[PDB]
Write a protein that binds this DNA or RNA. Structure first.
Lengths: 179, 248, 301, 301
DNA sequence: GGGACAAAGGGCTTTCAGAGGAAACCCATCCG
């Protein structure tokens, strides 16, 4: 029920990641995995060319299957055995790509460090799902990909409604009065 | 807390409203700290802390679905299909008017600083925007904590950002505490090995992700301690305020 | 072979601002009145190609508008421009390619580029479709406490003028290495009482409105990108198509669907590669490459 | 085959303004006073088809009104009209389709169109239902410092006149490639003391008021698109049904619910597509296409 | 002249996938 989809993923050039820069520019191909951020309710993302895959009999992809009821932590820890544990961990490989990314100088004691900011995959999905049901009507809505959003990520392909962003508009000084 | 310089009613157009993947609006305190560091390195004058207040701000567009800026063909991979409506890669823009306070350590004179600041401001940027106009800078002198209220009140009128800290995380705190998140620093993930495409081959390179903290907006006349409204670089790649967590 | 770097970037050397609109009289241009936007609702028919059996139904739309009041008959558009130097300074990369390009260049004539950039403002091309319907357009330009007034016609076919030279020579000095200069521009027109004005639009996802106009705290304004686009419409240096277009790499007009400077051995990148690899270019080619390098952007692939 | 481009649009070449309503005397038309709107509350019965059980209940409504003062007996409606040229110049797209369409046209006679456009204003069709109940209607047209006075009846059945031709000759020259021309139009009525006037309503959602009228600073006015609709009611060139209608693709009247020029080989898009593909059009078809191009719209898909 | 590699460019393209969803906030002082 789960293994066949794992051979499906490893057959293509798929990758598992928690942070990536593809959320800022579609042409980016930078994928890295963080092990210290894995928890009970940590959402992860995956990338395969054209996001084709094969759906289940009821119809599900890996992004939905692993992020439904926290079977990712149920497998990463090894509660389902050591057969589905090594294969999944084999996909967690870094991939460096800095073309078309921001680069900023930051003060680090005596000297400077150049940094390339990238976005986190867990935060977008977690915030969208948590905030859609709490009625927080002080947010924007952004859609990635465009006319064909199936070539950016797996989360964008399935979450076609659009990710949510905080509206950080500050109060403004009203004129024609004291303040 | 000795010498302060005030520049009020600065008009900037085309500010990059996208500070992170989930924050759209005011630039974080990191942008103003970097502007102060750039002023210090270019001008040769040591700057201690920076304070910013929002006079006006507006994100282009509507209540939701802010805006999209049209793109153009500018890469060397096309020429045949580069004739109709290049892809988007969204990038929001906004327009705002701010007020800035800079802590300066300079005692050579009193009027040279105004000229040297005005020289740098005429050719500077704020989060990628273009400065339209600004008022003449003036310098205030503080000898003790009691007269810090006067230099604080010299910044009227504007809304200053104060730090309140995070309890659990920004998502739960925003719904419950009713505050807005902000970026205060970056966390390093892994070191860059290939140094070919980087803008500098001497500075070490890192992959970083933003760290979020919750802030609040307060009137200048309602600030208890002025040291809570000044930001500066901290430890472990963070930006922190002198007064710590703001408490009423 | 001196292969170009993977990513090459340059800054923008011309900085415009958001234009502001006011309503004044032709003889009382001292006191100004702001122009609001407002919202209206219109009704009509459905005329869409390919749908003939649905043409007997109605159509209700909600739009924005902007027009002068019935007691004012003059539109005033005011803005500022900044010209800065430090050309041939790459923002990302370039240690030998940029120096070779700089050495190959700097022999071009910046006087023509400075004349054309100032003429696009003086003649009145910076203001869009608000131009039509006006019997008199007056331009007031201020720089270094020295004002000039223009009533120049013939926006196309750049011709020799006496007053534009005193600004073109200053801009030429700034372009080939100097500090910064600032020009304050004001435009007066004679559209009439109640005439409709055309501020900038926006591309926004579907909302309660069908056409939303740009504004700044309830006052109609224009985007800085729109102001800057009209300034650099000087590309006259190709084979045909008089009434020139804006200078862009692979110079194309997406509105018209046509792309000049196509794959016929006249591109920005082809000329840039050929200039550093030995043989120099003609006057028109360097004048185009330098003008395009004045415009910012990142080149790579 | 020369298919039409995906994006293709034209701007508007006839620009009217919002009409202003004043109350004056028939022999003292120098001094004018505004016409306010106000609000009233009325009571009536419930007469709705299909509900005879609730026919004995009351009905309280609130509406707006507008009527002349009891000491004035003349209504004055004033506005301005602007005609601009540069026809056959597409705003969006068109490098081969627009040029071929312009080549196929421009052989038509602009004289009839310029005559009818001016006649629809002079005969008094721009002023709507306010016409009824008046025994004397006067029209004053000012252009090029030359005044013209009209008292012509028979709004329909275009006849020959000597004063309409002089203005129509100026309009026709501007239409076939020129700058702009402007007309000042004033209409005088003879309704009588205390008579009711009919300004333009507004499309409003659910609210307290059942009928609110368009007003500018509390003064009654008329929408400019309503004024422009009556100017271009010249489409007499279809098979029957004299007393023509306005020119529109798939020429339809939503008020009557019928749609002329349906899918029976008489469309704007069909004729425009066939004109460039070999066979030309007739005189009436060329005049219809030119008239529909003077009016704006989108043609592509 | 034939074989291999890389780059650039175009075109034959074309492969890939897919319907959620509901609502106007933060906040009152210096100065002539």
């Amino acid at each position: 029920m789960i293994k066949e989809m794992i051979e499906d993923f490893i057959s293509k050039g798929g990758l598992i990641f928690t942070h990536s820069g593809r959320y800022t520019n579609t042409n980016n191909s930078c994928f890295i995995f963080n092990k210290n951020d894995i928890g009970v309710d940590t959402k992860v993302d995956m990338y395969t060319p054209k996001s084709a895959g094969i759906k289940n009999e009821e119809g599900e992809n890996l992004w939905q299957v692993l992020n439904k009821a926290n079977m990712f932590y149920r497998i990463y820890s090894g509660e389902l055995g050591e057969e589905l544990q090594y294969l999944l961990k084999s996909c967690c490989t870094a991939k460096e790509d800095v073309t078309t990314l921001p680069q900023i100088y930051f003060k680090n004691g005596e000297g400077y460090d150049i940094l390339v900011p990238i976005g986190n995959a867990h935060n977008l999905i977690s915030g969208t799902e948590y905030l859609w049901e709490h009625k927080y009507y002080n947010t924007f809505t952004q859609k990635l990909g465009g006319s064909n959003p199936q070539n950016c990520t797996h989360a964008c392909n399935k979450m076609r409604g659009g990710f949510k962003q905080f509206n950080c508009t500050p109060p403004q000084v009203e004129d024609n009065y004291n303040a | 807390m000795r010498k302060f310089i005030i520049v009020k009613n600065v008009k900037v157009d085309g500010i990059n409203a996208k500070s992170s993947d989930i924050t759209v609006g005011m630039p974080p305190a990191t942008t103003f700290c970097g502007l102060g560091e750039t002023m210090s390195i270019k001008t040769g004058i040591v700057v201690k802390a920076v304070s910013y207040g929002s006079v006006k701000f507006e994100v282009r567009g509507s209540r939701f679905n802010t805006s999209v800026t049209k793109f153009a063909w500018q890469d060397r991979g096309n020429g045949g299909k580069a004739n109709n409506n290049s892809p988007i890669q969204p990038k929001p823009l906004a327009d705002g008017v701010f007020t800035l306070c800079f802590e300066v350590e300079w005692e050579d004179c009193a009027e040279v600083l105004v000229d040297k600041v005005t020289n740098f401001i005429n050719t500077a940027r704020i989060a990628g925007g273009t400065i339209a106009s600004f008022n003449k800078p003036f310098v205030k002198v503080a000898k003790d904590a009691e007269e810090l209220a006067s230099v604080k009140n010299a910044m009227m009128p504007c809304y200053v950002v104060v730090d309140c800290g995070v309890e659990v995380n920004i998502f739960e705190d925003a719904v419950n505490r009713k505050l807005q998140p902000m970026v205060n620093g970056y966390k390093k993930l892994e070191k860059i090995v290939d140094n070919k495409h980087m803008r500098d081959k001497f500075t070490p390179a890192y992959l970083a992700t933003p760290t979020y903290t919750m802030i609040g907006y307060k009137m200048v006349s309602n600030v208890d301690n002025f040291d809570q409204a000044l930001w500066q670089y901290g430890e472990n790649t963070k930006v922190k305020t002198i007064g710590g967590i703001y408490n009423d | 072979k001196l292969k170009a770097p993977a990513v090459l970037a340059y800054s923008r050397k011309i900085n415009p601002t958001n234009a502001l609109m006011f309503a004044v009289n032709w003889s009382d241009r001292d006191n100004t009145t702001a122009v609001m936007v407002g919202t209206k609702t219109v009704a009509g028919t459905q005329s869409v190609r390919g749908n003939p059996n649905d043409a007997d139904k109605g159509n209700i739309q909600t739009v924005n508008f902007a027009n002068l009041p019935h007691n004012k008959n003059t539109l005033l558009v005011k803005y500022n421009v900044k010209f800065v130097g430090d050309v041939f300074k790459a923002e990302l990369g370039g240690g030998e390619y940029s120096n070779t390009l700089q050495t190959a260049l700097e022999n071009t004539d910046f006087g023509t580029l400075a004349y054309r950039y100032v003429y696009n403002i003086a003649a009145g091309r910076t203001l869009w479709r608000n131009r039509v319907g006006a019997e008199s357009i007056e331009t007031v330009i201020t720089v270094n406490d020295q004002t000039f007034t223009f009533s120049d016609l013939l926006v196309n076919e750049f011709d020799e003028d006496v007053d534009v030279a005193e600004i073109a020579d200053m801009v030429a000095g700034v372009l080939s290495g100097e500090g910064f200069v600032t020009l304050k521009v004001e435009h007066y027109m004679l559209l009439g009482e109640g005439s409709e004005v055309f501020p900038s639009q926006e591309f926004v996802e579907n909302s309660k409105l069908s056409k939303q106009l740009f504004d700044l705290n309830g006052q109609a304004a224009m985007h800085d990108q729109k102001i800057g686009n009209a300034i650099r419409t000087i590309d006259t240096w190709y084979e045909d198509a008089t009434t020139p277009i804006a200078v862009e790499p692979y110079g194309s007009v997406v509105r018209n669907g046509v792309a000049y400077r196509a794959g016929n051995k006249t591109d920005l990148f082809t000329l840039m590669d050929g200039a550093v690899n030995g043989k120099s270019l003609t006057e028109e080619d360097q004048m185009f490459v330098t003008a395009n390098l004045i415009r910012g952007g990142v080149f790579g692939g």
